Symmetry: D2
Subunit: 264 residues, 4 copies
Amino acid sequence: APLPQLRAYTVDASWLQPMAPLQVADHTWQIGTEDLTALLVQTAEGAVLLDGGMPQMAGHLLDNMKLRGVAPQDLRLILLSHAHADHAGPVAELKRRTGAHVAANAETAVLLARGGSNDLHFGDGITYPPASADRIIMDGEVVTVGGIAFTAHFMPGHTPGSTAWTWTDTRDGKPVRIAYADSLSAPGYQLKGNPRYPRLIEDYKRSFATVRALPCDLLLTPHPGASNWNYAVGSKASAEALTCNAYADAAEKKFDAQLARETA
Amino acid sequence: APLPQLRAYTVDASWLQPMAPLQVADHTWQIGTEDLTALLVQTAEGAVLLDGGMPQMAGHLLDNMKLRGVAPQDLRLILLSHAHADHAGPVAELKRRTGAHVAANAETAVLLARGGSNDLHFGDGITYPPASADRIIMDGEVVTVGGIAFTAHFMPGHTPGSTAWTWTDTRDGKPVRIAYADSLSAPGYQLKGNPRYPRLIEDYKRSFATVRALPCDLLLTPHPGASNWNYAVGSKASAEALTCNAYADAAEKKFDAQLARETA
Amino acid sequence: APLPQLRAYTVDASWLQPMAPLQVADHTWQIGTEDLTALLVQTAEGAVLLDGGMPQMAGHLLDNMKLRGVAPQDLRLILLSHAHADHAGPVAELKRRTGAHVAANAETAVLLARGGSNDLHFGDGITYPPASADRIIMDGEVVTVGGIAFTAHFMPGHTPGSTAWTWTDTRDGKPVRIAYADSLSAPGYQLKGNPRYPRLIEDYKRSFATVRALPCDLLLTPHPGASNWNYAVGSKASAEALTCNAYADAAEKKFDAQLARETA
Amino acid sequence: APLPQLRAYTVDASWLQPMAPLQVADHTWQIGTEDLTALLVQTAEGAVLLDGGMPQMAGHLLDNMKLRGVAPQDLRLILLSHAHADHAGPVAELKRRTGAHVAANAETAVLLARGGSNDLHFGDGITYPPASADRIIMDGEVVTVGGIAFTAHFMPGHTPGSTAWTWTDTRDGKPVRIAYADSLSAPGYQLKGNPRYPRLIEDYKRSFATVRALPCDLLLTPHPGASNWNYAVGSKASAEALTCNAYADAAEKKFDAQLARETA
Ligand SMILES: CO[C@@]1(NC(=O)[C@@H](C)C(=O)O)C(=O)N2C(C(=O)O)=C(C)CO[C@@H]21
Ligand SMILES: CO[C@@]1(NC(=O)[C@@H](C)C(=O)O)C(=O)N2C(C(=O)O)=C(C)CO[C@@H]21
Ligand SMILES: CO[C@@]1(NC(=O)[C@@H](C)C(=O)O)C(=O)N2C(C(=O)O)=C(C)CO[C@@H]21
Ligand SMILES: CO[C@@]1(NC(=O)[C@@H](C)C(=O)O)C(=O)N2C(C(=O)O)=C(C)CO[C@@H]21
Ligand SMILES: [Zn+2]
Ligand SMILES: [Zn+2]
Ligand SMILES: [Zn+2]
Ligand SMILES: [Zn+2]
Ligand SMILES: [Zn+2]
Ligand SMILES: [Zn+2]
Ligand SMILES: [Zn+2]
Ligand SMILES: [Zn+2]
């Protein structure tokens, strides 16, 4: 009776289904897969990448950047929603091949430093190549690349360092406020009495109110289904997209029902 | 046509076949599995562990230490042959649960810090939970725990930081010189003209002569088959064990034949 | 006209004035200097150290532990108030010489990892030997060593990872609730409109209310003058010590007057 | 009798004496001070910096890069001779302000990671802001930026990770082989029987022969006096510069006389 073999982190095939660069605004592009968000922001002084999806998506992201006329040495910054294998996966390979820097808060940096290992809820079941954050960011801090200002909004819950990013782009000259809000889900998390996360419920509740008050005209999430984005239809992808109020309100209802069932 | 799924590092079942603590000398014990070496050294001032095998062997190692009367807080040091997933796997979990420190050289420390990712030959196919080395060790440096002196011998080749450890134990009062020599194999390595490792052949050749001159009465290797150890038979495990000369000479012949076929 | 020479972090002589182990409770001891707190907690399963003061105090701390019958290998844990050079100074040297582990939150860990460099308010003027945190701690998490439970209380302000620690000791069988609250001062900090710390005022205000509600019978601070401790008189050191209410209330008044003068 | 105050790392004023960009070859520039080398290499695809001198020289280096028409975001790589405070000082500040990556070997990376603390010979007397190496380099590995190939040559001795860099530039179309060899000095080092560095003498001797065989037409050293460079005279700076043979031969004679006096 030998010890069990290691089991690989397998996902649905749609998470690894590549797609062409879908345009979100004048400078914002979706360059990930159909069910995983990876936002590219093109400025005059370089490019910014938000999330990267699964670790094996590193080659696909560079091809889309090549399609948008972005050389690897033009990627200047990498911002993260939260440092899980399905979002910060290819960060390590992207740093070695692009010369880009990574900005994250202390909680995301320490989770990124150990490659998702020793997760508060998943243990070591979702490991990915570790990377190091080059700039430590605080709540409400502004990061500027090529004139576009990125304001950080801490929304702890899914991970201790879950961060939502807001920036103002344009759509035919008219300004649009984009809000890339992180996941508000707790899949299989022990909500009450968790010794690894004692104030988990208080952080989720504060994060619900944080997402409601985000300056947002167009909302995006790491998993596009959470905000009803459908990258497959391309032109009509943002048709049924939720607001920040509707996204946080629906997430809180599923959180309260989940908390009530945990006490049962 | 989606991107490929991640594939888990799977090994032969004998590598994960637990065994009772086999005695090597008065203070040296084999507490790993049948085909993976994990040496425990009991002193009066604490315990020292050499290697740990696969990551999922962390629970098995603590049970054997419990069988030998070693509490988790008595493990004081963790020494490594080389920082691969099948040898330094459970190092991260052991540090969190035992309060032990890890001593390794700079090359093993940087490979251990990124959890085996970005391997010079395997890329990211053999990732394990990352750990941090607490003490950086040089070639020929002595580490002393409870009166037993551990001398490091750098033997680069399999990994840039492959290290052999020598210490003198006893067997019924009579001293015996133990040499835990690292692997001298190059499974699928590009030996000549490797841009990631330009002086690979020069390091292997120097490591062959290094193993021959090791002060050794009893030889052990991370994979027990490399030195003809058979942990299954227990009492007669060291019956057909090789010398340091025979181990390095056989490894060099397989290396030269492999190098000659690579040029073909 | 050459560039300026580096300037060393110099303090008042009383901060470096060694003292004998002063007893705070049955198991709690002050083993630092006269104007710098370094708390030693002796249990049956090991010892815990809270803060260490200046970097050059590493030799003095081990001598006091020797006076209390604590060998270097008995120090099991190192807890921190905040990772500044005058409190977490000798942490790096203590880890190499004691085999102890360090527990801190993500913000204290990243500041400890870069040795106090790139401080949000002091830049690189207060660098100390860097150390690595072995266990990442969350708000309200309990750390247990030898039966004594240490509960963490995040109180950001002086540093982003300022932490207060509470544990219950005894004094002749009678239980006493000890609260080691971190500094609530902001010496020369830009409080309003700080780009490195946008929500600085909101964190201080929340930390003021956090200290008021600490379960505390006896209060201690990293700088003993902040809570009116006088380690010099020894037996009557805790005579005029402040409560948690009086400490947080006085710190908030000095904070409000400082904020009002910054707007002037 | 209080503990001693910290003492700052003070150097001669000429080490901090700024100078205008002196031209070494078509693409190689000296942009450091008069007695500290900091080499800038301008290519079409970016710029490469070799060493940076003292930590307080970060502002001076960016001004010279501005004089050469190099924006901060054009510095792509930072190479190091060895990670001491007087050579790798401003590496941490340069990474935060330029978006550049650092390439070094494992021994230089671990010394750079702890900011020069716990030095094998100087202890903690020469601490500088810590930085992290982004790419780990092996002996003989080639690093290419903008068409210029940088070959690494390990020459351990002054530090365990001392590295010499060779690249081929031009001087009016004619190619010139530049060799930036690291220091071969051992100021106050215990050469024989050093427990922190057992094979110190064997590494110096091997490094002496390594420098002799460097492909070199023009030699440069971190301290320009070691190779008889005089940056002050500008146009005639390379007048009396030594060869690789003369530099290694003179360093070995001073090493042998120093070793013979240590035995006395
Ligand atoms: C670690 O990645 C996740 N978990 C998994 O993929 C497996 C392990 C699973 O839980 O089934 C995780 O958390 N995500 C989220 C999110 O909302 O962020 C949701 C909803 C589920 O998918 C990813
Ligand atoms: C990464 O671990 C190893 N490789 C594998 O397990 C797979 C990936 C494989 O190569 O088939 C590796 O190297 N080892 C050694 C050794 O001699 O050290 C040998 C001989 C083969 O087993 C382990
Ligand atoms: C970095 O250490 C401190 N600052 C200094 O020592 C110098 C630089 C200084 O500010 O004069 C710092 O902050 N402390 C505190 C505290 O309350 O924690 C107070 C009140 C002042 O002393 C230490
Ligand atoms: C740490 O920096 C050095 N040492 C000092 O600056 C002080 C501490 C000193 O030794 O007097 C060091 O080593 N260098 C070298 C070199 O050859 O690299 C020489 C010759 C001396 O200067 C620098
Ligand atoms: Zn997730
Ligand atoms: Zn997810
Ligand atoms: Zn291996
Ligand atoms: Zn192996
Ligand atoms: Zn402070
Ligand atoms: Zn202080
Ligand atoms: Zn030096
Ligand atoms: Zn020097």
